[PDB]
């Protein structure tokens, strides 16, 4: 999969 | 939302 | 293009 | 860049 | 959210 | 894997 930066504010990387 | 890595050159970020 | 950070283990930057 | 298909409901596409 | 050709083989839609 | 339209120009699908 990838990793992309996305919110949750706060910033984290999300594995899709 | 997400932060890409694109060049439009140069190479930035960009939210979605 | 785009540089994604995907998975192929290893972890890359791919020229999308 | 690439092009992404995006839900702003309506979808459109983004120029990344 | 948007919607990418993926596979499944079988190519369809997929939200994310 | 999925097919993503990004401009290289030219505007093409790429598989990931």
Not at 4 to 10: L, M, N, T, V
């Amino acid at each position: 999969a990838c990793v992309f930066a996305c919110e949750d504010a706060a910033i984290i990387g999300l594995a899709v």
